[PDB]
Amino acid sequence: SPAFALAVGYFKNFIFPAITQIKENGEVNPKICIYKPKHFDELTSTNIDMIKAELTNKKYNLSEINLSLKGARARDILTLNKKSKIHSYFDFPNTLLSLYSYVDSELKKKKFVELLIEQFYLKLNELIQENNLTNNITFCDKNLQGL
Amino acid sequence: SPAFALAVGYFKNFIFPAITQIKENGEVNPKICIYKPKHFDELTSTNIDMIKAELTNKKYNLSEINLSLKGARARDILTLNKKSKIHSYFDFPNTLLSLYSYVKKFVELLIEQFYLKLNELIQENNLTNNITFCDKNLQG
Numbered sequence: 001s002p003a004f005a006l007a008v009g010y011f012k013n014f015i016f017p018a019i020t021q022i023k024e025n026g027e028v029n030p031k032i033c034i035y036k037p038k039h040f041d042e043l044t045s046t047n048i049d050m051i052k053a054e055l056t057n058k059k060y061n062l063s064e065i066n067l068s069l070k071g072a073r074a075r076d077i078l079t080l081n082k083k084s085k086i087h088s089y090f091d092f093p094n095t096l097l098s099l100y101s102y103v104d105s106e107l108k109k110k111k112f113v114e115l116l117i118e119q120f121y122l123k124l125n126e127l128i129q130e131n132n133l134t135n136n137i138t139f140c141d142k143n144l145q146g147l
Numbered sequence: 148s149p150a151f152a153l154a155v156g157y158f159k160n161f162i163f164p165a166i167t168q169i170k171e172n173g174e175v176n177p178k179i180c181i182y183k184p185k186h187f188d189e190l191t192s193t194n195i196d197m198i199k200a201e202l203t204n205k206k207y208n209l210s211e212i213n214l215s216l217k218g219a220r221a222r223d224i225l226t227l228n229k230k231s232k233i234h235s236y237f238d239f240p241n242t243l244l245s246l247y248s249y250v251k252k253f254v255e256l257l258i259e260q261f262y263l264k265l266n267e268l269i270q271e272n273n274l275t276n277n278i279t280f281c282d283k284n285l286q287g
């Protein structure tokens with residue numbers, strides 16, 4: 001599966017290092033909410049701009065996480081939307097925005113993108129559960145509400 | 148196929164917007180060298196640290212590229228190693244470091260397929276003179 005590979009890279013190179021680092025830095029109950037779109041149109045610039053405005057309205061700022069953990073890593077600085085003064089984070093998975101290019105009538109490809117989205121989150125959720133991270137890693141809708 | 152997905156995301160979300168932006172910014176002949184291993188032991192933390200110290204020694208520093216282009220993206224600020232005072236850049240593809248976790252030397256098969264697709268995307272976008280591949284010693 002192509003989406004499984006993208007989920008593995010997203011988890012192993014971003015979500016897992018971020019939450020592991022934050023826990024070591026002292027935060028005992030940090031939360032990373034991962035945006036979970038369903039439909040192809042949620043990957044458009046219009047929906048991305050909506051979420052970016054919403055992050056600003058709710059006082060999130062793009063912030064760095066410096067990595068000090070073990071592990072082969074070419075990047076040592078992660079960037080995550082972080083709520084002001086609060087141990088909550090948000091991410092729109094950028095990798096999902098490559099799915100249309102990968103798949104490439106125009107309507108048939110959009111439905112294939114939506115199946116890849118579903119499989120992406122199928123694998124990502126599996127990885128979260130297998131690392132017992134459900135208390136820290138959750139999924140957010142368009143309104144940054146859990147589930 | 149999984150290696151193709153990783154290469155497409157690496158090209159579409161990083162290499163292609165980076166080179167397009169810096170050209171739009173007025174860099175006429177910028178160069179990006181992409182590290183290309185082929186042995187599994189080149190993805191170890193020891194080899195990565197040698198590349199990092201080498202980049203430092205050759206006066207490369209992480210440089211910010213602000214994306215103002217057309218296209219949907221959730222991440223608008225890229226970071227890329229840039230040689231001091233020169234339109235020359237280097238990247239170790241971080242996405243390669245997930246191939247072991249996705250999977251003996253079947254990883255090296257995936258690495259070869261990653262670079263076949265990546266090299267294909269460079270040719271199809273007429274970027275063969277701007278984007279090349281480098282070894283552990285930052286040589287083409």
Ligand SMILES: Nc1nc2c(ncn2[C@@H]2O[C@@H]3COP(=O)(O)O[C@H]4[C@@H](O)[C@H](n5cnc6c(N)ncnc65)O[C@@H]4COP(=O)(O)O[C@H]3[C@H]2O)c(=O)[nH]1
Binds near residue numbers: 013
């Ligand atoms: N918000 C956020 N998301 C991240 C970060 N690092 C990774 N991600 C996400 O994991 C995916 C795979 O990461 P990778 O580091 O293993 O491969 C990356 C990496 O090899 C490269 N790349 C992208 N942005 C980069 C960057 N800022 N610096 C260095 N390399 C970068 O492009 C590949 C695909 O990027 P992507 O945006 O499509 O998907 C990321 C992205 O969705 C991060 O630091 N912040």
